[PDB]
Every structure is written in structure tokens, then in C-alpha cells.
């Protein structure tokens, strides 16, 4: 098995020079062996990707899926450790940069069928990962307007060359 996500919190950067932008804080947290399908967990992860910590918590508090409570607990733990140990000034000044669900170690069981035949149930377990980055959530990628999109078209037209000749 791999446990690199936990190690990711132990990387120490060298001191920044005074004339350098303040490096945003980053907190890697995860919960391993959640009794929940990674496919079902992925929907919640995608839902909360890119949102502020408070908005993500609000969205998860009112979600009926079982994984919502687990993700909320993980996010709360991440916030607590970010404030205590990663020198994050404000609780709410955090946004979910990364949130993914990983397959866990699963167990195989037998499902009895009608005519003495059987199938192999898998007691599915999944991991859950979050990276919390300090600072306001990045603005959503604005949809490309007609002006810029026609600009792209004209650039493509100009890029044309006389192919297969001198």
C-alpha cells in the first residue's frame, strides 16, 4: 500500500526572501478504508472541488449521501490541523484545491445464487484525499466569449502555411 499523502504534510520549504510573494499554505489530509464505494465518493469529491472550506461544509451538511458526513469530518479535521500546525491564520480562508476518492483494500465474499451457483461480492472500501490551500477560491474559468473565440479562429487562419512546397 501507499501512504504518500500523509508524508506530503512533512515537506518543509526553505525560508522565503522578504521580496517574495507569501507562499499559500497547503494541508494534505485523508481518511483510509471508508466503507463506501469510491465511485460514489467521487461524486462528492467532484462536488466540493474548488470550493471554499465553508461552502464545502455547507454543501456537505445538507447532502443525503453517506459519504457526505465522512467528507465533512475529514474537512473539519483538515481545517483544525491547518490552523493548529500549518500556521493558517483564518479557518475560512481555505479552499479545496484537490479532492479525490481512491480504491481501498477490499474483501471478497460469496453471494449465493439460485441453482447452486454464486457470485463474488466485494466489501468495497475507499480512501478519501483532500488538499486545502490557503486563500480565496480561484475564480471559475470564465466562459470564452465570442470575441476571444473568433480571435482564436483568426489566429488559426493566420497560422496557415503553404504546405508541401519550398
Amino acid at each position: 500500500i501507499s501512504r504518500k499523502w500523509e508524508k506530503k504534510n512533512k515537506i518543509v520549504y526553505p525560508p522565503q526572501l522578504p521580496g517574495e510573494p507569501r507562499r499559500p499554505a497547503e494541508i494534505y489530509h485523508c481518511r483510509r478504508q471508508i466503507k463506501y464505494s469510491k465511485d460514489k465518493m467521487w461524486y462528492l469529491a467532484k462536488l466540493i472541488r474548488g470550493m471554499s472550506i465553508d461552502q464545502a461544509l455547507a454543501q456537505l451538511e445538507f447532502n443525503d449521501k453517506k459519504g457526505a458526513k465522512i467528507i465533512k469530518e475529514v474537512l473539519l479535521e483538515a481545517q483544525d490541523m491547518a490552523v493548529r500546525d500549518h500556521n493558517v491564520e483564518f479557518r475560512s480562508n481555505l479552499y479545496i484545491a484537490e479532492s479525490t476518492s481512491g480504491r481501498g483494500q477490499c474483501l471478497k465474499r460469496i453471494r449465493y445464487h439460485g441453482r447452486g451457483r454464486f457470485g463474488i461480492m466485494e466489501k468495497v472500501y475507499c480512501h478519501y484525499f483532500v488538499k486545502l490551500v490557503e486563500g480565496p477560491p480561484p475564480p471559475p474559468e470564465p466562459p470564452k466569449t465570442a470575441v476571444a473565440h473568433a480571435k482564436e479562429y483568426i489566429q488559426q487562419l493566420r497560422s496557415r502555411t503553404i504546405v508541401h512546397t519550398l
Binding site: 465511485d39 467532484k46 455547507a58 451538511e61 445538507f62 447532502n63
Partner: protein
């Protein structure tokens, strides 16, 4: 009927990452003025409702102790009085349920 070919991960992603399947963002979440916990606009605050349910459970335990047995529903009104409270003029002729705690602020 059995599948004729394994469905590729590309097709499966196209299917199961569709917006129709993605979880929709709720925009009716608000902060309860009373306690500041999160609630939905059309739903009662969970925290405040838990307060009310716990106080109701205590009052109902007192009611059960007073009644003392099944099928003992009173034929008269009921009034809940807390420590340091006395039945008022309209509270006369109504069964009194005594609570050992002080009057809650939200209760009136």
C-alpha cells in the same frame, strides 16, 4: 441479453461524469439567525429543533411521571412551569408540569 463488448473507460466516464449525474449545488442554504448554524430556507434549523425536541422529551417524561400509567390522558389543559414560576390566573384549573431547570429564553 448479455453485453456484446466491454464498455471502454472513455465511454464510462462520458456516462458517469455527465452533469445529469453530477451532484447539484444547493443554493437554499442559509444561516439561522437564532443560533448561527446552517439550515435550509424551507427546513427548520436542526440545532434549534434538537433543542426543542430535547425540552419536549423532558416535559413528556414529567407528564408520564404525573400520569402514572397508560390511558391516563387528562381531560384538562396542561401548563409547563419552570423553577421560580407560579401558576397565573388563567393557569388555574390546568394540570401543572414542573421542570427543575430555569425558564428557557426561547420558551415563552
Amino acid at each position: 441479453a448479455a453485453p456484446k463488448n466491454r464498455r471502454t473507460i472513455e465511454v464510462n466516464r462520458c456516462r458517469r461524469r455527465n452533469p445529469q449525474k453530477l451532484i447539484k449545488v444547493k443554493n437554499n442554504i442559509d444561516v439561522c439567525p437564532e443560533c448561527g448554524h446552517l439550515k435550509q430556507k424551507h427546513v427548520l434549523c436542526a440545532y434549534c429543533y434538537e433543542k426543542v425536541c430535547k425540552e419536549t422529551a423532558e416535559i413528556r417524561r414529567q407528564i408520564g411521571k404525573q400520569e402514572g400509567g397508560p390511558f391516563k390522558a387528562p381531560t384538562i389543559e396542561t401548563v409547563v412551569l419552570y423553577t421560580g414560576e407560579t401558576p397565573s390566573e388563567q393557569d388555574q384549573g390546568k394540570r401543572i408540569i414542573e421542570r427543575d431547570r430555569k425558564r428557557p429564553s426561547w420558551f415563552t
